Design an enzyme around this catalytic site. Structure first.
Site, PDB file in Angstrom:
ATOM      1  N   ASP A  46       4.115  -1.975  -3.548  1.00  0.00           N
ATOM      2  CA  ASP A  46       4.172  -0.619  -4.105  1.00  0.00           C
ATOM      3  C   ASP A  46       5.518  -0.234  -4.691  1.00  0.00           C
ATOM      4  O   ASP A  46       6.408   0.183  -3.949  1.00  0.00           O
ATOM      5  CB  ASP A  46       3.787   0.355  -2.969  1.00  0.00           C
ATOM      6  CG  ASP A  46       3.582   1.811  -3.406  1.00  0.00           C
ATOM      7  OD1 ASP A  46       3.610   2.074  -4.622  1.00  0.00           O
ATOM      8  OD2 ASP A  46       3.363   2.678  -2.516  1.00  0.00           O
TER       9      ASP A  46
ATOM     10  N   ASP B 244       4.526   2.362 -11.499  1.00  0.00           N
ATOM     11  CA  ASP B 244       4.056   2.372 -10.109  1.00  0.00           C
ATOM     12  C   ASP B 244       2.885   1.426  -9.871  1.00  0.00           C
ATOM     13  O   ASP B 244       1.742   1.777 -10.161  1.00  0.00           O
ATOM     14  CB  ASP B 244       3.654   3.819  -9.782  1.00  0.00           C
ATOM     15  CG  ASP B 244       3.181   3.995  -8.336  1.00  0.00           C
ATOM     16  OD1 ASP B 244       3.307   3.020  -7.542  1.00  0.00           O
ATOM     17  OD2 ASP B 244       2.797   5.132  -7.975  1.00  0.00           O
TER      18      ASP B 244
HETATM   19  C1  LIG Z   1       5.672   6.788   2.262  1.00  0.00           C
HETATM   20  O1  LIG Z   1       4.373   7.378   2.056  1.00  0.00           O
HETATM   21  C2  LIG Z   1       3.565   6.956   1.054  1.00  0.00           C
HETATM   22  C3  LIG Z   1       3.619   5.624   0.581  1.00  0.00           C
HETATM   23  C4  LIG Z   1       2.747   5.237  -0.440  1.00  0.00           C
HETATM   24  C5  LIG Z   1       1.804   6.119  -0.975  1.00  0.00           C
HETATM   25  C6  LIG Z   1       0.906   5.635  -2.102  1.00  0.00           C
HETATM   26  C7  LIG Z   1      -0.384   4.996  -1.577  1.00  0.00           C
HETATM   27  C8  LIG Z   1      -0.841   5.202  -0.268  1.00  0.00           C
HETATM   28  C9  LIG Z   1      -2.028   4.619   0.179  1.00  0.00           C
HETATM   29  C10 LIG Z   1      -2.800   3.856  -0.687  1.00  0.00           C
HETATM   30  C11 LIG Z   1      -2.347   3.635  -1.999  1.00  0.00           C
HETATM   31  C12 LIG Z   1      -3.194   2.888  -2.976  1.00  0.00           C
HETATM   32  C13 LIG Z   1      -4.586   3.130  -3.044  1.00  0.00           C
HETATM   33  N1  LIG Z   1      -5.322   2.519  -3.973  1.00  0.00           N
HETATM   34  C14 LIG Z   1      -4.767   1.666  -4.837  1.00  0.00           C
HETATM   35  N2  LIG Z   1      -3.463   1.432  -4.821  1.00  0.00           N
HETATM   36  C15 LIG Z   1      -2.655   1.998  -3.916  1.00  0.00           C
HETATM   37  C16 LIG Z   1      -1.168   4.255  -2.440  1.00  0.00           C
HETATM   38  N3  LIG Z   1       1.667   4.716  -2.966  1.00  0.00           N
HETATM   39  C17 LIG Z   1       1.771   5.200  -4.167  1.00  0.00           C
HETATM   40  N4  LIG Z   1       2.397   4.597  -5.232  1.00  0.00           N
HETATM   41  C18 LIG Z   1       1.078   6.494  -4.266  1.00  0.00           C
HETATM   42  N5  LIG Z   1       0.837   7.445  -5.188  1.00  0.00           N
HETATM   43  C19 LIG Z   1       0.149   8.454  -4.767  1.00  0.00           C
HETATM   44  C20 LIG Z   1      -0.244   9.638  -5.616  1.00  0.00           C
HETATM   45  S1  LIG Z   1      -0.270   8.243  -3.121  1.00  0.00           S
HETATM   46  C21 LIG Z   1       0.551   6.764  -3.042  1.00  0.00           C
HETATM   47  C22 LIG Z   1       1.754   7.433  -0.491  1.00  0.00           C
HETATM   48  C23 LIG Z   1       2.592   7.829   0.554  1.00  0.00           C
END
Ligand SMILES: COc1ccc([C@]2(c3cccc(-c4cncnc4)c3)N=C(N)c3nc(C)sc32)cc1
EC number: 3.4.23.46
Length: 376
Positions: free
Chosen positions: A36, A220
């Protein structure tokens, strides 16, 4: 742990991200972790959950250290809560190293884990500025660079059908063709970039360029879609509708909610236009474009029940938090996160999208004498 041994180290399911195998603790506990670039915590499932095949068991790790600090992260689409600590971390199909890193052990979550995604945690590769609870929690990549001789760069080659490669510490020339074009990282928090022009089938959207970056534009891998600010999203939909007018789809399709299906092998790719995103170059008023075909922005939805057909979701959506160049945009490109030089590189990858008439491309340079600063 050569770059050749890092090739094809990513797997995934369409719309559910890309994950890498990692190990946490001693003896190592193997976990699939979502890669991520939109967040900055290393956060892993550490308690049973209906969607988790496995989870981090801290009591079985003799190298775990509790930091006696909790973390609570409500976010726009869900929430996760956990406990901070440190432990030994490795990437089996990554660099030949083991480092001590911060780990947020997720003890409770809502709408965070996905039914059948095959991943159990997230590897947030962005900067400390957006780490939770605050910037004092050193992100994984920062720890990796500090503790090893790994150069301060990684690259992602995301592929559609999923798989791909995460090359840590370098650029693997066998994963791209042509030139690598660089866009500056505007600020070190998210991987913030600047879009200077947008065209749909070569037709300029004709907006003040600040509109494309209202309030920030980011790269992202943890967001599926290309997400655009309201004004930009509306103009993009009007243009894609005008190009594809020989066929009419429900409002639901355009809202990214409903499927559009065609008999297997007959998707009318030609009626959908190409999207050109012009990114700020390394020199004043120079830019380069990345071209996005409908094979990228019409995301295929795999379902045995609909398999007589080829079904897709429209993978462009409205945003109130700025532009997001998500997974569908990165797919088919080799994206270099050159943290050392504060820049992001784009090149056509080996798994680039194409048909008999059109191909995804990275082209430049383009000059624009009539340019204001496109940043917000
Ligand atoms: C530190 O806290 C966080 C860490 C990561 C995420 C998150 C995310 C979270 C869970 C699942 C995914 C995801 C779902 N489906 C496909 N790809 C990623 C993304 N990662 C992103 N780039 C993201 N963007 C969002 C709007 S929510 C989220 C949100 C909070």
């Amino acid at each position: 742990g050569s770059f050749v041994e890092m090739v094809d180290n990513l797997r995934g399911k369409s719309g559910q991200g890309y994950y890498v195998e990692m190990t946490v603790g001693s003896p190592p506990q193997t976990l699939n972790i979502l890669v991520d670039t939109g967040s900055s915590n290393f956060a892993v499932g550490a308690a049973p959950h209906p969607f988790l095949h496995r989870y981090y068991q801290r009591q079985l790790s003799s190298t775990y250290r509790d930091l006696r600090k909790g973390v609570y992260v409500p976010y726009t689409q869900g929430k996760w809560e956990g406990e901070l600590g440190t432990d030994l971390v490795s990437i089996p199909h990554g660099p030949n190293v083991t480092v001590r890193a911060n780990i947020a052990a997720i003890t409770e979550s809502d709408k965070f884990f996905i039914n059948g995604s095959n991943w159990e945690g997230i590897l947030g590769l962005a900067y400390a500025e957006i780490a939770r609870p605050d910037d004092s929690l050193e992100p994984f990549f920062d720890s990796l660079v500090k503790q090893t001789h790994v150069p301060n760069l990684f690259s992602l080659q995301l592929c559609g059908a999923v798989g791909g490669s995460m090359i840590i510490g370098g650029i693997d020339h066998s994963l791209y063709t042509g030139s690598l074009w660089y866009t500056p990282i505007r600020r070190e928090w998210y991987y913030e970039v600047i879009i200077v022009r947008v065209e749909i089938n070569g037709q300029d959207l004709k907006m003040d360029c600040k509109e494309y970056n209202y309030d920030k534009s980011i790269v992202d891998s943890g967001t599926t879609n290309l997400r655009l600010p309201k004004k930009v999203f509306e103009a993009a939909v009007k243009s894609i509708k005008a190009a594809s007018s020989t066929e009419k789809f429900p409002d639901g399709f355009w809202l990214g909610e409903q499927l559009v299906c065609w008999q297997a092998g007959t998707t009318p790719w030609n009626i959908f236009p190409v999207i050109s995103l012009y990114l700020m170059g390394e020199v004043t008023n120079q830019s380069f474009r990345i071209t996005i075909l409908p094979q990228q922005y019409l995301r295929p939805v795999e379902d045995v029940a609909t398999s007589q057909d080829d079904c897709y979701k429209f993978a462009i959506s409205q945003s109130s938090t700025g532009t997001v160049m998500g997974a569908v945009i990165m797919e088919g490109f080799y994206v270099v996160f050159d943290r050392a030089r504060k820049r992001i590189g784009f090149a056509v990858s080996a798994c680039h999208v194409h048909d008999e008439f059109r191909t995804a491309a990275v082209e430049g340079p383009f000059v624009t004498l009539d340019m204001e600063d496109c940043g917000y």
